[PDB]
Each structure stands twice: as C-alpha cells, then as structure tokens.
Amino acid sequence: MNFKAVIKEVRLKSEHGYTNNFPSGDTLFIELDVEAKEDLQDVVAGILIRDRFGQDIFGINTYLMEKKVELKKGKYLFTFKMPLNLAPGKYTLTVALHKGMDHAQECYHWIDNVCNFEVNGFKKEQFVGVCYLPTEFNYRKIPKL
Amino acid sequence: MNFKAVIKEVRLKSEHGYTNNFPSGDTLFIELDVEAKEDLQDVVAGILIRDRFGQDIFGINTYLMEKKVELKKGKYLFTFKMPLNLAPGKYTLTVALHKGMDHAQECYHWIDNVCNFEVNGFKKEQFVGVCYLPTEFNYRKIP
C-alpha cells in the first residue's frame, strides 16, 4: 500500500460507551482516525466482520454504499453505523482505505483483523444461527368460506 | 409425532407474488396453512433457514418471540415476515408446530426442508459475507 491515507486508531462504540463486548442487536459504531498526507479525490473505506474461524460474516464499502468521499490534507473521523444482528460469539474486524475498487487502482491502507470483539446476550429476541433477521408473526382463523 | 395440529401447506411470497427466488434484502413472507383437529392451548411455531452447506443461518419460534398462540378447532393461517438480509445463494426453510416448548419435544408437526428458495439479486446495496447488516457511514474533518 502507498500510505497517502492512514488509519491511526480504531475504536468500537456502543451508543453509550466504548466497548468490545456487545449484546446481539446492539448498535455498533466503528470509528477510524484517518490521516491524509495529501489531497485525495476519491477515497473508499471498507469494513469486514469475520467469524471466529475466518468466515466472512459481513463487509461493505463506501463505494458499494454510493457515498463519495473526498479528503484534504488533515485528520478525519470515519464512522460506520450498523445493528449488530449477529449470533453471540467471538469476532474480528478488518478495515481498509483505497481509491478504486475494480482491479484496485491503488490501496492506501488496510489492517487485517485490527480488532477482536465479542457478542454476548440478546438485546432483541433470542434466535439460533449466525445472523438475526427482525421478524413479525401473526395468525388468523380462516373460515371454510 | 402427535397430529392434534398439523401444518398442511407452506408458501413463500415476496411483496409482489408467490415465488421462491428473492433478491437480497427483499421482504419474505412465509405462510403456513395450519389445521387444528381439536382445541390446542399453548401452541408454538418455528422456522429455520439453512445453508446449502448445513449451516444454520437463522431460526426463531413464536415462543422466543413471546407471542402466545391458542387455537380452536378449524383452519388457520400462520405468517412470518422478515427481511432476507442474506447473501445470494441457495437456501432451505424448515417449519414446525409443537406445544408450549423449546427443542420441540412435544411436536405436532415437523417438516425438514419443506421449501427451497434462493436469493439471487441485491435489492439494497451489495455486501460480502453471510448476512447483510444495514449500514450508515459518515466522515468529518477534525483538528
């Protein structure tokens, strides 16, 4: 990677305090301290949550999200917000900054498994399986009309 | 397994029609036709979506949802509604009735892989990994 922009610190945040231990469904904030050695006109930041055994659980880009990011030389705060709709367990976070995405016109900075965090308990209902889909349920008697 | 209540049909429906092929993030409607030969108190319905590789992706029941279900003899319609925040791929659905239980030890009806469905497109953004967590992103210049 060239290092025109750099991730200097990552912080995991609930809506009430910093922590690396969340109930399932709690809102997760990923904060990245970014520094841009120069002016970059198309920056793309990505996050990737992984399993305790290396399975990709979820990853996304600001390009995939259709969010344009232009930086000037200086320090920045990048924040990702998302419901932690994941089964209890042990996880790792991976992050990256680059310009392009197809054939990666260049890589600015990426940190493999920069962080460990865990998910314990349920803030919403209990469920089984890797992920949680918010669900509603109803039933009606139907007459043989 | 005791048949005092029986699941007689399962249907998958998008918000536009019955179908077994959904884009990722589309809303999924699971309809179960239930029949109650008699009066059942303390009924519990569950669904389980599974990988094409045996991985449990997501499962829940009406007990875990704290929704009490009491039937009188007759026909019923059970519906489950949920965003299919799942990676593109091929999946199976499993559904069951049991009385007021977990593990479904008093099971009225259990149908393994009652339905096959696939997720093919992306209705929301693209993502990688098993599931999709809806994400928001912001950036601010700081001193």
PDB file of C-alpha atoms in Angstrom:
ATOM      1  CA  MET A   1       0.000   0.000   0.000  1.00  0.00           C
ATOM      2  CA  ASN A   2       1.153   3.604  -0.732  1.00  0.00           C
ATOM      3  CA  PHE A   3       0.052   5.226   2.574  1.00  0.00           C
ATOM      4  CA  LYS A   4      -1.306   8.533   1.293  1.00  0.00           C
ATOM      5  CA  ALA A   5      -4.085   7.991   3.850  1.00  0.00           C
ATOM      6  CA  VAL A   6      -3.614   6.008   7.045  1.00  0.00           C
ATOM      7  CA  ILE A   7      -5.821   4.533   9.773  1.00  0.00           C
ATOM      8  CA  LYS A   8      -4.138   5.572  13.016  1.00  0.00           C
ATOM      9  CA  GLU A   9      -6.681   4.232  15.511  1.00  0.00           C
ATOM     10  CA  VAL A  10      -9.865   2.168  15.562  1.00  0.00           C
ATOM     11  CA  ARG A  11     -12.436   2.434  18.349  1.00  0.00           C
ATOM     12  CA  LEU A  12     -15.525   0.264  18.857  1.00  0.00           C
ATOM     13  CA  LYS A  13     -18.523   2.030  20.282  1.00  0.00           C
ATOM     14  CA  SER A  14     -21.991   1.288  21.541  1.00  0.00           C
ATOM     15  CA  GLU A  15     -24.406   4.216  21.695  1.00  0.00           C
ATOM     16  CA  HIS A  16     -23.483   4.715  25.369  1.00  0.00           C
ATOM     17  CA  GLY A  17     -19.782   3.958  25.718  1.00  0.00           C
ATOM     18  CA  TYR A  18     -16.726   2.415  24.181  1.00  0.00           C
ATOM     19  CA  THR A  19     -16.521  -1.355  24.469  1.00  0.00           C
ATOM     20  CA  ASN A  20     -15.602  -4.523  22.599  1.00  0.00           C
ATOM     21  CA  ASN A  21     -18.434  -6.571  24.177  1.00  0.00           C
ATOM     22  CA  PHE A  22     -21.966  -6.134  22.779  1.00  0.00           C
ATOM     23  CA  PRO A  23     -25.378  -7.777  23.144  1.00  0.00           C
ATOM     24  CA  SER A  24     -26.843  -9.098  19.945  1.00  0.00           C
ATOM     25  CA  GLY A  25     -28.694  -6.363  18.100  1.00  0.00           C
ATOM     26  CA  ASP A  26     -26.919  -3.538  19.937  1.00  0.00           C
ATOM     27  CA  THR A  27     -25.961  -0.691  17.626  1.00  0.00           C
ATOM     28  CA  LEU A  28     -22.276  -0.789  16.698  1.00  0.00           C
ATOM     29  CA  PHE A  29     -20.221   2.319  15.809  1.00  0.00           C
ATOM     30  CA  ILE A  30     -16.853   1.795  14.101  1.00  0.00           C
ATOM     31  CA  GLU A  31     -14.672   4.910  14.442  1.00  0.00           C
ATOM     32  CA  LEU A  32     -11.498   5.222  12.362  1.00  0.00           C
ATOM     33  CA  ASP A  33      -8.980   8.014  12.970  1.00  0.00           C
ATOM     34  CA  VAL A  34      -7.828   8.806   9.430  1.00  0.00           C
ATOM     35  CA  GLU A  35      -4.930  10.996   8.303  1.00  0.00           C
ATOM     36  CA  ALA A  36      -4.468  12.129   4.701  1.00  0.00           C
ATOM     37  CA  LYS A  37      -0.877  13.045   3.813  1.00  0.00           C
ATOM     38  CA  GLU A  38      -2.274  14.960   0.838  1.00  0.00           C
ATOM     39  CA  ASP A  39      -5.494  15.693  -1.025  1.00  0.00           C
ATOM     40  CA  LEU A  40      -7.258  12.543  -2.229  1.00  0.00           C
ATOM     41  CA  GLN A  41     -10.216  12.990  -4.567  1.00  0.00           C
ATOM     42  CA  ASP A  42     -11.800   9.508  -4.367  1.00  0.00           C
ATOM     43  CA  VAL A  43     -11.324   7.642  -1.105  1.00  0.00           C
ATOM     44  CA  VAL A  44     -13.178   4.395  -0.353  1.00  0.00           C
ATOM     45  CA  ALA A  45     -13.323   2.916   3.143  1.00  0.00           C
ATOM     46  CA  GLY A  46     -14.405  -0.628   3.899  1.00  0.00           C
ATOM     47  CA  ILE A  47     -15.127  -2.774   6.932  1.00  0.00           C
ATOM     48  CA  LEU A  48     -15.247  -6.565   7.166  1.00  0.00           C
ATOM     49  CA  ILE A  49     -16.504  -8.533  10.155  1.00  0.00           C
ATOM     50  CA  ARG A  50     -15.252 -12.094  10.367  1.00  0.00           C
ATOM     51  CA  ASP A  51     -16.115 -15.275  12.254  1.00  0.00           C
ATOM     52  CA  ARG A  52     -14.007 -16.843  14.981  1.00  0.00           C
ATOM     53  CA  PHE A  53     -12.912 -19.285  12.256  1.00  0.00           C
ATOM     54  CA  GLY A  54     -12.313 -16.828   9.396  1.00  0.00           C
ATOM     55  CA  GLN A  55     -15.733 -16.896   7.734  1.00  0.00           C
ATOM     56  CA  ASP A  56     -16.716 -13.546   6.226  1.00  0.00           C
ATOM     57  CA  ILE A  57     -19.804 -12.502   8.150  1.00  0.00           C
ATOM     58  CA  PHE A  58     -20.354  -9.067   6.607  1.00  0.00           C
ATOM     59  CA  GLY A  59     -18.316  -6.492   4.699  1.00  0.00           C
ATOM     60  CA  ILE A  60     -19.167  -3.331   2.782  1.00  0.00           C
ATOM     61  CA  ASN A  61     -17.662  -0.253   1.083  1.00  0.00           C
ATOM     62  CA  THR A  62     -18.468   3.412   0.867  1.00  0.00           C
ATOM     63  CA  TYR A  63     -18.400   2.765  -2.876  1.00  0.00           C
ATOM     64  CA  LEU A  64     -20.951  -0.043  -2.560  1.00  0.00           C
ATOM     65  CA  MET A  65     -22.983   2.360  -0.404  1.00  0.00           C
ATOM     66  CA  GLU A  66     -22.844   5.093  -3.108  1.00  0.00           C
ATOM     67  CA  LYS A  67     -21.158   7.561  -0.715  1.00  0.00           C
ATOM     68  CA  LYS A  68     -18.488   9.813  -2.260  1.00  0.00           C
ATOM     69  CA  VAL A  69     -15.528  10.691  -0.005  1.00  0.00           C
ATOM     70  CA  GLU A  70     -13.073  13.499  -0.794  1.00  0.00           C
ATOM     71  CA  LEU A  71     -10.343  14.428   1.665  1.00  0.00           C
ATOM     72  CA  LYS A  72      -7.982  17.355   2.185  1.00  0.00           C
ATOM     73  CA  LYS A  73      -4.689  17.081   3.986  1.00  0.00           C
ATOM     74  CA  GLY A  74      -5.626  16.868   7.653  1.00  0.00           C
ATOM     75  CA  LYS A  75      -7.179  14.484  10.139  1.00  0.00           C
ATOM     76  CA  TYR A  76     -10.592  12.880   9.798  1.00  0.00           C
ATOM     77  CA  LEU A  77     -13.067  10.737  11.653  1.00  0.00           C
ATOM     78  CA  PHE A  78     -14.766   7.965   9.642  1.00  0.00           C
ATOM     79  CA  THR A  79     -17.758   6.313  11.271  1.00  0.00           C
ATOM     80  CA  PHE A  80     -19.721   3.222  10.334  1.00  0.00           C
ATOM     81  CA  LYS A  81     -23.077   2.548  11.997  1.00  0.00           C
ATOM     82  CA  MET A  82     -24.919  -0.788  11.918  1.00  0.00           C
ATOM     83  CA  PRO A  83     -27.108  -3.103  14.036  1.00  0.00           C
ATOM     84  CA  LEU A  84     -25.020  -5.972  15.362  1.00  0.00           C
ATOM     85  CA  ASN A  85     -27.629  -8.542  14.276  1.00  0.00           C
ATOM     86  CA  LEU A  86     -25.159 -11.420  14.814  1.00  0.00           C
ATOM     87  CA  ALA A  87     -25.138 -14.578  16.928  1.00  0.00           C
ATOM     88  CA  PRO A  88     -23.184 -14.471  20.196  1.00  0.00           C
ATOM     89  CA  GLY A  89     -19.588 -15.425  19.620  1.00  0.00           C
ATOM     90  CA  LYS A  90     -16.100 -14.097  19.040  1.00  0.00           C
ATOM     91  CA  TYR A  91     -15.394 -11.826  16.059  1.00  0.00           C
ATOM     92  CA  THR A  92     -12.702  -9.780  14.380  1.00  0.00           C
ATOM     93  CA  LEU A  93     -12.834  -6.553  12.378  1.00  0.00           C
ATOM     94  CA  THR A  94     -10.832  -5.756   9.223  1.00  0.00           C
ATOM     95  CA  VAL A  95     -10.643  -2.272   7.643  1.00  0.00           C
ATOM     96  CA  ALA A  96      -9.172  -0.676   4.528  1.00  0.00           C
ATOM     97  CA  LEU A  97      -8.863   2.572   2.538  1.00  0.00           C
ATOM     98  CA  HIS A  98      -8.298   2.682  -1.218  1.00  0.00           C
ATOM     99  CA  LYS A  99      -9.136   4.751  -4.299  1.00  0.00           C
ATOM    100  CA  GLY A 100     -10.500   2.269  -6.841  1.00  0.00           C
ATOM    101  CA  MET A 101     -12.365  -0.954  -6.294  1.00  0.00           C
ATOM    102  CA  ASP A 102     -12.243  -2.842  -9.626  1.00  0.00           C
ATOM    103  CA  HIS A 103      -8.630  -4.009 -10.034  1.00  0.00           C
ATOM    104  CA  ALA A 104      -7.854  -1.758  -7.029  1.00  0.00           C
ATOM    105  CA  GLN A 105      -6.407   1.286  -8.784  1.00  0.00           C
ATOM    106  CA  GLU A 106      -4.449   1.587  -5.552  1.00  0.00           C
ATOM    107  CA  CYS A 107      -4.523   0.653  -1.862  1.00  0.00           C
ATOM    108  CA  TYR A 108      -3.947   3.388   0.693  1.00  0.00           C
ATOM    109  CA  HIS A 109      -4.007   1.423   3.969  1.00  0.00           C
ATOM    110  CA  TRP A 110      -5.599  -1.779   5.193  1.00  0.00           C
ATOM    111  CA  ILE A 111      -5.332  -3.546   8.558  1.00  0.00           C
ATOM    112  CA  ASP A 112      -6.179  -7.246   8.708  1.00  0.00           C
ATOM    113  CA  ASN A 113      -8.154  -8.238  11.805  1.00  0.00           C
ATOM    114  CA  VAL A 114      -7.321  -4.956  13.506  1.00  0.00           C
ATOM    115  CA  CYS A 115      -9.669  -5.774  16.383  1.00  0.00           C
ATOM    116  CA  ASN A 116     -11.271  -8.542  18.394  1.00  0.00           C
ATOM    117  CA  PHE A 117     -14.762  -8.083  19.765  1.00  0.00           C
ATOM    118  CA  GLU A 118     -17.423 -10.415  21.133  1.00  0.00           C
ATOM    119  CA  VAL A 119     -21.229 -10.572  21.144  1.00  0.00           C
ATOM    120  CA  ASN A 120     -22.828 -11.788  24.411  1.00  0.00           C
ATOM    121  CA  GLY A 121     -26.522 -11.939  25.229  1.00  0.00           C
ATOM    122  CA  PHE A 122     -29.539 -10.736  23.295  1.00  0.00           C
ATOM    123  CA  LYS A 123     -30.896  -7.211  23.305  1.00  0.00           C
ATOM    124  CA  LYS A 124     -33.752  -8.239  20.991  1.00  0.00           C
ATOM    125  CA  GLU A 125     -35.333 -11.726  20.995  1.00  0.00           C
ATOM    126  CA  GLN A 126     -33.268 -14.905  21.162  1.00  0.00           C
ATOM    127  CA  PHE A 127     -32.579 -16.721  17.924  1.00  0.00           C
ATOM    128  CA  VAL A 128     -30.452 -19.529  16.551  1.00  0.00           C
ATOM    129  CA  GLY A 129     -27.979 -19.349  13.685  1.00  0.00           C
ATOM    130  CA  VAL A 130     -25.275 -16.955  12.603  1.00  0.00           C
ATOM    131  CA  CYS A 131     -27.385 -13.849  11.973  1.00  0.00           C
ATOM    132  CA  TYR A 132     -30.683 -12.344  13.139  1.00  0.00           C
ATOM    133  CA  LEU A 133     -33.476 -11.166  10.824  1.00  0.00           C
ATOM    134  CA  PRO A 134     -36.088  -8.989  12.597  1.00  0.00           C
ATOM    135  CA  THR A 135     -39.315 -10.968  12.312  1.00  0.00           C
ATOM    136  CA  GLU A 136     -43.030 -10.349  12.808  1.00  0.00           C
ATOM    137  CA  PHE A 137     -45.659 -13.055  13.265  1.00  0.00           C
ATOM    138  CA  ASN A 138     -49.457 -13.232  13.045  1.00  0.00           C
ATOM    139  CA  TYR A 139     -52.151 -15.884  12.846  1.00  0.00           C
ATOM    140  CA  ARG A 140     -55.828 -15.755  11.880  1.00  0.00           C
ATOM    141  CA  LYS A 141     -58.567 -18.351  11.891  1.00  0.00           C
ATOM    142  CA  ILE A 142     -59.814 -18.828   8.348  1.00  0.00           C
ATOM    143  CA  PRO A 143     -63.410 -20.000   7.843  1.00  0.00           C
ATOM    144  CA  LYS A 144     -64.046 -22.605   5.187  1.00  0.00           C
ATOM    145  CA  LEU A 145     -65.886 -19.852   3.310  1.00  0.00           C
TER     146      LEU A 145
ATOM    147  CA  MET B   1     -45.341 -37.120  16.373  1.00  0.00           C
ATOM    148  CA  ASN B   2     -48.844 -36.236  17.644  1.00  0.00           C
ATOM    149  CA  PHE B   3     -51.053 -34.691  14.952  1.00  0.00           C
ATOM    150  CA  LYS B   4     -53.605 -32.749  17.013  1.00  0.00           C
ATOM    151  CA  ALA B   5     -52.446 -29.734  14.968  1.00  0.00           C
ATOM    152  CA  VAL B   6     -50.925 -30.198  11.509  1.00  0.00           C
ATOM    153  CA  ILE B   7     -49.097 -27.954   9.015  1.00  0.00           C
ATOM    154  CA  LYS B   8     -50.843 -28.682   5.698  1.00  0.00           C
ATOM    155  CA  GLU B   9     -49.126 -26.145   3.388  1.00  0.00           C
ATOM    156  CA  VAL B  10     -46.169 -23.756   3.352  1.00  0.00           C
ATOM    157  CA  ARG B  11     -45.884 -20.833   0.933  1.00  0.00           C
ATOM    158  CA  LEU B  12     -43.154 -18.307   0.211  1.00  0.00           C
ATOM    159  CA  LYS B  13     -44.253 -14.896  -1.068  1.00  0.00           C
ATOM    160  CA  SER B  14     -42.491 -11.689  -1.954  1.00  0.00           C
ATOM    161  CA  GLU B  15     -44.392  -8.448  -1.710  1.00  0.00           C
ATOM    162  CA  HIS B  16     -45.350  -8.879  -5.390  1.00  0.00           C
ATOM    163  CA  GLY B  17     -46.299 -12.542  -5.736  1.00  0.00           C
ATOM    164  CA  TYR B  18     -45.636 -16.066  -4.670  1.00  0.00           C
ATOM    165  CA  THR B  19     -42.101 -17.055  -5.569  1.00  0.00           C
ATOM    166  CA  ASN B  20     -39.027 -18.991  -4.420  1.00  0.00           C
ATOM    167  CA  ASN B  21     -36.436 -16.569  -5.823  1.00  0.00           C
ATOM    168  CA  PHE B  22     -35.812 -13.303  -3.966  1.00  0.00           C
ATOM    169  CA  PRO B  23     -33.253 -10.508  -4.304  1.00  0.00           C
ATOM    170  CA  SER B  24     -31.211  -9.957  -1.195  1.00  0.00           C
ATOM    171  CA  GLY B  25     -32.963  -7.693   1.292  1.00  0.00           C
ATOM    172  CA  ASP B  26     -36.441  -8.234  -0.149  1.00  0.00           C
ATOM    173  CA  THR B  27     -39.151  -8.850   2.420  1.00  0.00           C
ATOM    174  CA  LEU B  28     -40.035 -12.545   2.743  1.00  0.00           C
ATOM    175  CA  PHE B  29     -43.492 -13.774   3.750  1.00  0.00           C
ATOM    176  CA  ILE B  30     -43.706 -17.371   4.990  1.00  0.00           C
ATOM    177  CA  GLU B  31     -47.327 -18.555   5.026  1.00  0.00           C
ATOM    178  CA  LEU B  32     -48.238 -21.790   6.850  1.00  0.00           C
ATOM    179  CA  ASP B  33     -51.649 -23.372   6.498  1.00  0.00           C
ATOM    180  CA  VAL B  34     -52.363 -24.958   9.884  1.00  0.00           C
ATOM    181  CA  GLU B  35     -55.190 -27.333  10.770  1.00  0.00           C
ATOM    182  CA  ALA B  36     -56.286 -27.970  14.360  1.00  0.00           C
ATOM    183  CA  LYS B  37     -58.165 -31.256  14.765  1.00  0.00           C
ATOM    184  CA  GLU B  38     -59.126 -30.124  18.255  1.00  0.00           C
ATOM    185  CA  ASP B  39     -58.597 -27.299  20.737  1.00  0.00           C
ATOM    186  CA  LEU B  40     -54.912 -26.608  21.400  1.00  0.00           C
ATOM    187  CA  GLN B  41     -53.672 -24.220  24.034  1.00  0.00           C
ATOM    188  CA  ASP B  42     -50.023 -23.371  24.227  1.00  0.00           C
ATOM    189  CA  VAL B  43     -49.035 -23.718  20.560  1.00  0.00           C
ATOM    190  CA  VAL B  44     -45.557 -22.775  19.259  1.00  0.00           C
ATOM    191  CA  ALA B  45     -44.486 -22.289  15.634  1.00  0.00           C
ATOM    192  CA  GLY B  46     -40.882 -22.119  14.461  1.00  0.00           C
ATOM    193  CA  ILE B  47     -38.951 -21.543  11.244  1.00  0.00           C
ATOM    194  CA  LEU B  48     -35.333 -22.338  10.400  1.00  0.00           C
ATOM    195  CA  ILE B  49     -33.422 -21.101   7.330  1.00  0.00           C
ATOM    196  CA  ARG B  50     -30.373 -23.207   6.474  1.00  0.00           C
ATOM    197  CA  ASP B  51     -27.329 -23.042   4.210  1.00  0.00           C
ATOM    198  CA  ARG B  52     -26.854 -25.278   1.245  1.00  0.00           C
ATOM    199  CA  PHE B  53     -23.899 -26.465   3.411  1.00  0.00           C
ATOM    200  CA  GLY B  54     -25.717 -27.352   6.626  1.00  0.00           C
ATOM    201  CA  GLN B  55     -25.064 -24.058   8.373  1.00  0.00           C
ATOM    202  CA  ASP B  56     -27.967 -22.732  10.426  1.00  0.00           C
ATOM    203  CA  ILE B  57     -28.330 -19.176   9.136  1.00  0.00           C
ATOM    204  CA  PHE B  58     -31.345 -18.027  11.141  1.00  0.00           C
ATOM    205  CA  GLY B  59     -34.143 -19.620  13.123  1.00  0.00           C
ATOM    206  CA  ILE B  60     -36.758 -18.401  15.586  1.00  0.00           C
ATOM    207  CA  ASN B  61     -40.076 -19.525  17.047  1.00  0.00           C
ATOM    208  CA  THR B  62     -43.147 -17.765  18.426  1.00  0.00           C
ATOM    209  CA  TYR B  63     -42.116 -18.696  21.978  1.00  0.00           C
ATOM    210  CA  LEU B  64     -38.785 -16.896  21.661  1.00  0.00           C
ATOM    211  CA  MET B  65     -40.897 -14.043  20.283  1.00  0.00           C
ATOM    212  CA  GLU B  66     -43.191 -14.152  23.372  1.00  0.00           C
ATOM    213  CA  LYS B  67     -46.301 -14.431  21.168  1.00  0.00           C
ATOM    214  CA  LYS B  68     -48.841 -16.794  22.714  1.00  0.00           C
ATOM    215  CA  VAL B  69     -50.788 -18.855  20.200  1.00  0.00           C
ATOM    216  CA  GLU B  70     -54.028 -20.584  21.168  1.00  0.00           C
ATOM    217  CA  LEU B  71     -56.146 -22.461  18.601  1.00  0.00           C
ATOM    218  CA  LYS B  72     -59.700 -23.684  18.420  1.00  0.00           C
ATOM    219  CA  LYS B  73     -60.652 -26.451  16.016  1.00  0.00           C
ATOM    220  CA  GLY B  74     -60.577 -25.123  12.482  1.00  0.00           C
ATOM    221  CA  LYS B  75     -58.159 -23.859   9.876  1.00  0.00           C
ATOM    222  CA  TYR B  76     -55.633 -21.115  10.478  1.00  0.00           C
ATOM    223  CA  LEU B  77     -53.072 -19.056   8.576  1.00  0.00           C
ATOM    224  CA  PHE B  78     -49.654 -18.519  10.171  1.00  0.00           C
ATOM    225  CA  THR B  79     -47.429 -15.843   8.623  1.00  0.00           C
ATOM    226  CA  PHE B  80     -43.785 -14.999   9.287  1.00  0.00           C
ATOM    227  CA  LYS B  81     -42.409 -11.731   7.813  1.00  0.00           C
ATOM    228  CA  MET B  82     -38.727 -10.770   7.662  1.00  0.00           C
ATOM    229  CA  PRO B  83     -36.048  -9.018   5.550  1.00  0.00           C
ATOM    230  CA  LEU B  84     -33.926 -11.528   3.649  1.00  0.00           C
ATOM    231  CA  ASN B  85     -30.655  -9.840   4.648  1.00  0.00           C
ATOM    232  CA  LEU B  86     -28.824 -12.940   3.406  1.00  0.00           C
ATOM    233  CA  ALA B  87     -26.044 -13.461   0.902  1.00  0.00           C
ATOM    234  CA  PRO B  88     -27.025 -14.599  -2.593  1.00  0.00           C
ATOM    235  CA  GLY B  89     -27.128 -18.390  -2.712  1.00  0.00           C
ATOM    236  CA  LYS B  90     -29.446 -21.383  -2.283  1.00  0.00           C
ATOM    237  CA  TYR B  91     -31.286 -21.981   0.993  1.00  0.00           C
ATOM    238  CA  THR B  92     -33.795 -24.241   2.716  1.00  0.00           C
ATOM    239  CA  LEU B  93     -36.697 -23.489   5.058  1.00  0.00           C
ATOM    240  CA  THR B  94     -37.810 -25.760   7.904  1.00  0.00           C
ATOM    241  CA  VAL B  95     -41.029 -25.234   9.889  1.00  0.00           C
ATOM    242  CA  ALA B  96     -42.720 -26.937  12.840  1.00  0.00           C
ATOM    243  CA  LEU B  97     -45.557 -26.934  15.383  1.00  0.00           C
ATOM    244  CA  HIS B  98     -45.101 -28.119  18.969  1.00  0.00           C
ATOM    245  CA  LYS B  99     -47.000 -27.275  22.039  1.00  0.00           C
ATOM    246  CA  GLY B 100     -45.526 -24.821  24.653  1.00  0.00           C
ATOM    247  CA  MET B 101     -41.920 -25.884  24.306  1.00  0.00           C
ATOM    248  CA  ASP B 102     -38.382 -25.300  23.202  1.00  0.00           C
ATOM    249  CA  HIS B 103     -36.440 -28.022  21.381  1.00  0.00           C
ATOM    250  CA  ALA B 104     -39.909 -29.080  20.149  1.00  0.00           C
ATOM    251  CA  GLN B 105     -40.038 -32.177  22.366  1.00  0.00           C
ATOM    252  CA  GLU B 106     -43.877 -32.211  22.191  1.00  0.00           C
ATOM    253  CA  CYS B 107     -44.024 -31.867  18.415  1.00  0.00           C
ATOM    254  CA  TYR B 108     -47.292 -31.669  16.439  1.00  0.00           C
ATOM    255  CA  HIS B 109     -45.630 -31.434  13.028  1.00  0.00           C
ATOM    256  CA  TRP B 110     -42.042 -31.023  11.771  1.00  0.00           C
ATOM    257  CA  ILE B 111     -41.148 -30.745   8.071  1.00  0.00           C
ATOM    258  CA  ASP B 112     -37.437 -30.726   7.211  1.00  0.00           C
ATOM    259  CA  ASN B 113     -36.513 -28.584   4.195  1.00  0.00           C
ATOM    260  CA  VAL B 114     -40.202 -28.081   3.476  1.00  0.00           C
ATOM    261  CA  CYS B 115     -39.212 -25.429   0.937  1.00  0.00           C
ATOM    262  CA  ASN B 116     -36.256 -24.488  -1.215  1.00  0.00           C
ATOM    263  CA  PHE B 117     -35.643 -20.879  -2.086  1.00  0.00           C
ATOM    264  CA  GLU B 118     -32.783 -18.873  -3.462  1.00  0.00           C
ATOM    265  CA  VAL B 119     -31.557 -15.320  -3.059  1.00  0.00           C
ATOM    266  CA  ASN B 120     -30.097 -14.045  -6.287  1.00  0.00           C
ATOM    267  CA  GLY B 121     -30.002 -10.281  -6.791  1.00  0.00           C
ATOM    268  CA  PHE B 122     -29.348  -7.384  -4.460  1.00  0.00           C
ATOM    269  CA  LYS B 123     -32.353  -5.228  -3.601  1.00  0.00           C
ATOM    270  CA  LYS B 124     -30.305  -2.948  -1.303  1.00  0.00           C
ATOM    271  CA  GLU B 125     -26.549  -2.356  -1.583  1.00  0.00           C
ATOM    272  CA  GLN B 126     -24.106  -5.110  -2.335  1.00  0.00           C
ATOM    273  CA  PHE B 127     -22.187  -6.677   0.508  1.00  0.00           C
ATOM    274  CA  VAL B 128     -19.938  -9.650   1.188  1.00  0.00           C
ATOM    275  CA  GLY B 129     -20.345 -12.367   3.806  1.00  0.00           C
ATOM    276  CA  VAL B 130     -23.249 -14.453   5.012  1.00  0.00           C
ATOM    277  CA  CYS B 131     -25.638 -11.696   6.110  1.00  0.00           C
ATOM    278  CA  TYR B 132     -26.256  -8.008   5.467  1.00  0.00           C
ATOM    279  CA  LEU B 133     -26.266  -5.520   8.306  1.00  0.00           C
ATOM    280  CA  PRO B 134     -27.853  -2.228   7.166  1.00  0.00           C
ATOM    281  CA  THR B 135     -25.038   0.296   7.399  1.00  0.00           C
ATOM    282  CA  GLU B 136     -24.716   4.061   7.605  1.00  0.00           C
ATOM    283  CA  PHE B 137     -21.442   5.935   7.107  1.00  0.00           C
ATOM    284  CA  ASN B 138     -20.224   9.476   7.787  1.00  0.00           C
ATOM    285  CA  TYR B 139     -16.974  11.424   7.801  1.00  0.00           C
ATOM    286  CA  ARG B 140     -15.974  14.666   9.470  1.00  0.00           C
ATOM    287  CA  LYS B 141     -12.786  16.672   9.334  1.00  0.00           C
ATOM    288  CA  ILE B 142     -11.337  17.139  12.825  1.00  0.00           C
ATOM    289  CA  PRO B 143      -8.499  19.339  14.091  1.00  0.00           C
TER     290      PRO B 143
END
